[PDB]
Amino acid sequence: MKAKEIRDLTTSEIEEQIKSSKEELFNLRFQLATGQLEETARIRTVRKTIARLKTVAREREIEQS
Amino acid sequence: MHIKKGDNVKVIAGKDKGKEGKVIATLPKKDRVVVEGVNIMKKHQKPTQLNPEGGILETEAAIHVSNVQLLDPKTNEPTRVGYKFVDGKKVRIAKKSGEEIK
Amino acid sequence: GKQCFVTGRKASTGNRRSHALNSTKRRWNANLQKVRILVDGKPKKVWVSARALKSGKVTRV
Amino acid sequence: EARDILKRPVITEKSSEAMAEDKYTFDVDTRVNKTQVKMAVEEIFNVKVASVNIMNYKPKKKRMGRYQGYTNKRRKAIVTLKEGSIDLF
RNA sequence: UAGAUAGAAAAUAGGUGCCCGUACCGCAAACCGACACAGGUAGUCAAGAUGAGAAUUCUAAGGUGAGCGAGCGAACUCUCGU
RNA sequence: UGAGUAGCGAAAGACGGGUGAGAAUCCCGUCCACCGAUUGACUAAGGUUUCCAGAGGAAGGCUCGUCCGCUCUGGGUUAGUCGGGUCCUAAGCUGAGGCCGACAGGCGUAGGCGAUGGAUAACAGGUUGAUAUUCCUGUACCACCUAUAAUCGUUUUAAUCG
RNA sequence: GAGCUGUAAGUAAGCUUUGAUCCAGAGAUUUCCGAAUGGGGAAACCCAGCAUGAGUUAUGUCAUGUUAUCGAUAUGUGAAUACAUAGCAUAUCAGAAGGCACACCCGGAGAACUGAAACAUCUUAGUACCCGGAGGAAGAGAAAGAAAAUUCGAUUCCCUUAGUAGCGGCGAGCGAAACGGGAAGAGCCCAAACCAACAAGCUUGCUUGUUGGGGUUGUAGGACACUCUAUACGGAGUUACAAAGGACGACAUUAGACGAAUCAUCUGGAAAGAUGAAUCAAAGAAGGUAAUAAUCCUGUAGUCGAAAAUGUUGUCUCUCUUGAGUGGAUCCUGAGUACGACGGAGCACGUGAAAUUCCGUCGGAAUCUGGGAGGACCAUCUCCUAAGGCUAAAUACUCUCUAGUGACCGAUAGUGAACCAGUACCGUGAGGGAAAGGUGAAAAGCACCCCGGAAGGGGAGUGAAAUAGAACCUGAAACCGUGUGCU
Numbered sequence A: 001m002k003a004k005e006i007r008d009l010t011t012s013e014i015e016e017q018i019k020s021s022k023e024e025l026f027n028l029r030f031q032l033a034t035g036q037l038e039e040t041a042r043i044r045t046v047r048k049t050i051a052r053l054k055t056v057a058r059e060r061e062i063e064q065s
Numbered sequence B: 001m002h003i004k005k006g007d008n009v010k011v012i013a014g015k016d017k018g019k020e021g022k023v024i025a026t027l028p029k030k031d032r033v034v035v036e037g038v039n040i041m042k043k044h045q046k047p048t049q050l051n052p053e054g055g056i057l058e059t060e061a062a063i064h065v066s067n068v069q070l071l072d073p074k075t076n077e078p079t080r081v082g083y084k085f086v087d088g089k090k091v092r093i094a095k096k097s098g099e100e101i102k
Numbered sequence C: 001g002k003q004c005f006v007t008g009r010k011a012s013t014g015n016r017r018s019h020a021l022n023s024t025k026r027r028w029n030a031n032l033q034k035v036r037i038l039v040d041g042k043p044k045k046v047w048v049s050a051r052a053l054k055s056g057k058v059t060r061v
Numbered sequence D: 001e002a003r004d005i006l007k008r009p010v011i012t013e014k015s016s017e018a019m020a021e022d023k024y025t026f027d028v029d030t031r032v033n034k035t036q037v038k039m040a041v042e043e044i045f046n047v048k049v050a051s052v053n054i055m056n057y058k059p060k061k062k063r064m065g066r067y068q069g070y071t072n073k074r075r076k077a078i079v080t081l082k083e084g085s086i087d088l089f
Numbered sequence E: 001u002a003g004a005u006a007g008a009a010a011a012u013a014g015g016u017g018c019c020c021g022u023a024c025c026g027c028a029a030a031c032c033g034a035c036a037c038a039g040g041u042a043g044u045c046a047a048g049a050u051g052a053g054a055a056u057u058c059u060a061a062g063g064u065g066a067g068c069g070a071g072c073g074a075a076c077u078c079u080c081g082u
Numbered sequence F: 001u002g003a004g005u006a007g008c009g010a011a012a013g014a015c016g017g018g019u020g021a022g023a024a025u026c027c028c029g030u031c032c033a034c035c036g037a038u039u040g041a042c043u044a045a046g047g048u049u050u051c052c053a054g055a056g057g058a059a060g061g062c063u064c065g066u067c068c069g070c071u072c073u074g075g076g077u078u079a080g081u082c083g084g085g086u087c088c089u090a091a092g093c094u095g096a097g098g099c100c101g102a103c104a105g106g107c108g109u110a111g112g113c114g115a116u117g118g119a120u121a122a123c124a125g126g127u128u129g130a131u132a133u134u135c136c137u138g139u140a141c142c143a144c145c146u147a148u149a150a151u152c153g154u155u156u157u158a159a160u161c162g
Numbered sequence G: 001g002a003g004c005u006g007u008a009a010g011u012a013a014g015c016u017u018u019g020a021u022c023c024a025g026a027g028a029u030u031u032c033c034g035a036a037u038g039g040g041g042a043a044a045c046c047c048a049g050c051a052u053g054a055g056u057u058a059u060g061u062c063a064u065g066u067u068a069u070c071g072a073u074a075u076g077u078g079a080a081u082a083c084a085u086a087g088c089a090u091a092u093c094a095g096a097a098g099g100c101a102c103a104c105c106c107g108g109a110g111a112a113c114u115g116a117a118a119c120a121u122c123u124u125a126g127u128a129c130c131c132g133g134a135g136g137a138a139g140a141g142a143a144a145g146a147a148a149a150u151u152c153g154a155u156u157c158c159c160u161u162a163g164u165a166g167c168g169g170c171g172a173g174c175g176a177a178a179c180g181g182g183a184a185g186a187g188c189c190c191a192a193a194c195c196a197a198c199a200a201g202c203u204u205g206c207u208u209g210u211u212g213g214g215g216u217u218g219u220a221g222g223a224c225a226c227u228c229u230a231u232a233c234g235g236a237g238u239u240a241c242a243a244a245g246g247a248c249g250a251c252a253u254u255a256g257a258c259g260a261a262u263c264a265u266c267u268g269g270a271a272a273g274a275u276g277a278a279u280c281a282a283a284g285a286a287g288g289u290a291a292u293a294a295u296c297c298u299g300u301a302g303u304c305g306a307a308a309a310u311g312u313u314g315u316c317u318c319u320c321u322u323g324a325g326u327g328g329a330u331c332c333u334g335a336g337u338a339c340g341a342c343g344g345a346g347c348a349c350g351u352g353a354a355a356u357u358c359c360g361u362c363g364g365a366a367u368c369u370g371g372g373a374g375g376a377c378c379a380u381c382u383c384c385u386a387a388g389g390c391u392a393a394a395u396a397c398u399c400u401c402u403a404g405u406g407a408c409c410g411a412u413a414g415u416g417a418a419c420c421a422g423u424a425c426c427g428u429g430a431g432g433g434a435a436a437g438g439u440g441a442a443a444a445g446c447a448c449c450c451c452g453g454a455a456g457g458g459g460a461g462u463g464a465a466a467u468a469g470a471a472c473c474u475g476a477a478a479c480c481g482u483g484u485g486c487u
């Protein structure tokens, strides 16, 4: 998910998205450990999505001040 | 590079000097290009690899980009390339005919 | 780190000289004396040189 | 933070025997304690944890060509379930 | 005791209890000696016969046959017996 | 070059059967021999993966090598009670202010740190290739928390804490 | 503007013209140790308080913030001891700390080997080392100067004076300065007299103190008195001369864009070489490309370009601000100072006839009819006006960045280090400290067969070459072998 869609989202929605993305990343890591993950690029995709969500949240709590 | 994937080029230096072909790959970091039917190498392929059948495989090896020259769209002669700006977009121009290449 | 509280008068270095002009390092110390004077409006025992004390220019209290 | 406390499951012969005994082995963040591991497991897998054993593994010397180095240090926990089960697959 | 404050709990039941070390060598081929080195390395346990004994000789529990061998059976050198 | 010379670092091996391209040298067996106040069993330092399993034989191993403390691959160390910390202090170290000293800094009070000593609650059995007072079985103990409490107290108190 | 997920090949999974990767400006995130600062500690670890919050029935557990010391400024409290002074407690602070560029600067402290053909004065040398303090430069600086004429007019730096004058067990050696020629230039502010306001002593005399004004010097200046001049007209300014800003513009730096002109044959694996015939040039710098290229590529000359940040500047704005003359009655013009003695030091100058200048100790002036200097000292003359402060430039240096250069090196050289080097290795530690570059144009890096367990090899094939097959360009010598003509 890109920064434009994230900026469309609301702050509570960003927090919920961060939670769900973290759960997805964790499940991917567990599948990788057990040898059940073929689509390894998903891990990096989700990690960068989490980074973008946090970046936008930080931008908002900065512009608030 | 001034040569681009898909261009029709003439070889101006090498064993294949005078051959024409299509640019099917470029290597910007090596200043190299791959041209169909040009620079054929015979590589020893082990049948024991992931491909069962093996032997001597013939394929194009990359050539240095300064050894191929664009062919003029009108005259079909080798030509250098300039650049124009049409409505704020860069256009490749053959320096012999002045026509847009692509 | 010993000097006159009032003037900063402090020790210096130089040579002791023999009759044959051999040289050895020595110091000239100030003639400091521990006196009670008024520092920031309160009595305080500080080191003051005799020369700074001369002619009652410093108040001992 | 539970998903950060637990890093991955450990799948070995000894770990499989433990799993037969209802003990599940995980590599965990090197900074966490036994209690944090228990709470993370209960939060993530909706089980009841009977106990947690924990241990540290030193960096291990490892070689590749002419380059000498070390593997990461590890913190390994063994979580004994009271109620429920965990399916790693 | 000075102080403190309405509350205190014999028992019963239930529950909570972190971090570090934990492998292996450790009179040694893994420690200190450049060595798979006749050296050095604190402490604990330490059976039977003999005996005053933890000495002596032979054994137990347990461990070990020593990281070049095969012949020959000269001088000479070493270690040993007469 | 010396020269295929000196050396191969305290010692008792023999044979049979395996394995292997190859065996005095690896594995298994029998007999024999050596230590046994110990060459046995623990364990503190120190080392730091050397431990275990499978594979290998260039180099290392004073020979050989099918083997290894070597090489490759994958594993292995589980604690309220064991040792240390969340307790104590010794020598010593450090040290707010302080004293002293060209600078740097030295000394030192209160206070801290600091085991080689003080305090301090878990034992037996079983189990793996590799951990076990740590895992498992049985049976305990210590501190704390929550609920219910025989009973006692209820503002000079008098139960309770200290 | 078409590929991309580094070295770094591979496989896998993916991304990218709905513009990836990549390049530049700005921003976000930025674990732990480290001055390291909640406390402790054998750095990268351990153990807490407090507040708020998460979780649990509750304890246990967790999250975030905060809690060092000293300093300064406030507030409260306040001992011996009455008054209040130690002290104590709280709050605020982009206050300090620590690092380093093995350079340059200023200062504290300060050797020795060495030279003197020995050695002590002397030299090495105020050097090395240590320590403190900086700054982008520092230091110095607007005459108590240099001099001796037609005088000059702050300081610093270069040339010269000059190896002169001098110093010196008059040994070894040490060694100026003024003048003259140059770089660069810039001048200012206080203290005091006096005035006004405020406060204490309460003569409630007018003394003291604070604030503001005034004032700044040798042609003596100022106060003071008087006369003109102006309330920013003018002038000045954040580089001193007082100190903060704002608007707009220009230029520059940090990515980039365009950018002329060659074909053929011969040799060859390959042409840029040779041959022939052309072309551009404000571009014939350079690198690359299968051998040696102005015209193949990257570029070069030339021209263009910035969303954003930064820097330097200009104009407005802003801010600040009176400027001259006359008079000589009184007043002011830097005190434990100048200076002296003794002991040291510094001056090129070693105590000397020793001026000039600093330190310790002790003594200790004058007040414009004054004071200092002109190398002891006195007189005269001449030049200055100490005992307060500030100040750009010309000068020094280079860890660093950008663009370049070399009758500098070319792998035992050049850095110790062309390479995963301050590494490996050595040492308890400080510390010492290596060796080691080259396949090929392209990886086309030897399919397949054969002997062998493997290693290794013989073919076959790739390649111009394998006799370039992996520390793989060339491949000398020592040294080691096989064969042999003569012996």
Ligand SMILES: [Mg+2]
Binding pocket: D054, D055, F079
């Ligand atoms: Mg443990």
Ligand SMILES: [Mg+2]
Binding pocket: E022, F077, F131
């Ligand atoms: Mg253990």
Ligand SMILES: [Mg+2]
Binding pocket: none
């Ligand atoms: Mg053990």
Ligand SMILES: [Mg+2]
Binding pocket: none
């Ligand atoms: Mg002993």
Ligand SMILES: [Mg+2]
Binding pocket: none
């Ligand atoms: Mg004996």
Ligand SMILES: [Mg+2]
Binding pocket: none
């Ligand atoms: Mg022989």
Ligand SMILES: [Mg+2]
Binding pocket: F005
């Ligand atoms: Mg001999």
Ligand SMILES: [Mg+2]
Binding pocket: none
């Ligand atoms: Mg012999």
Ligand SMILES: [Mg+2]
Binding pocket: none
């Ligand atoms: Mg022999």
Ligand SMILES: [Mg+2]
Binding pocket: none
């Ligand atoms: Mg032996």
Ligand SMILES: [Mg+2]
Binding pocket: none
């Ligand atoms: Mg082993």
Ligand SMILES: [Mg+2]
Binding pocket: none
């Ligand atoms: Mg061998």
Ligand SMILES: [Mg+2]
Binding pocket: none
């Ligand atoms: Mg102190």
Ligand SMILES: [Mg+2]
Binding pocket: F115
């Ligand atoms: Mg102890």
Ligand SMILES: [Mg+2]
Binding pocket: none
């Ligand atoms: Mg064991």
Ligand SMILES: [Mg+2]
Binding pocket: none
């Ligand atoms: Mg701390």
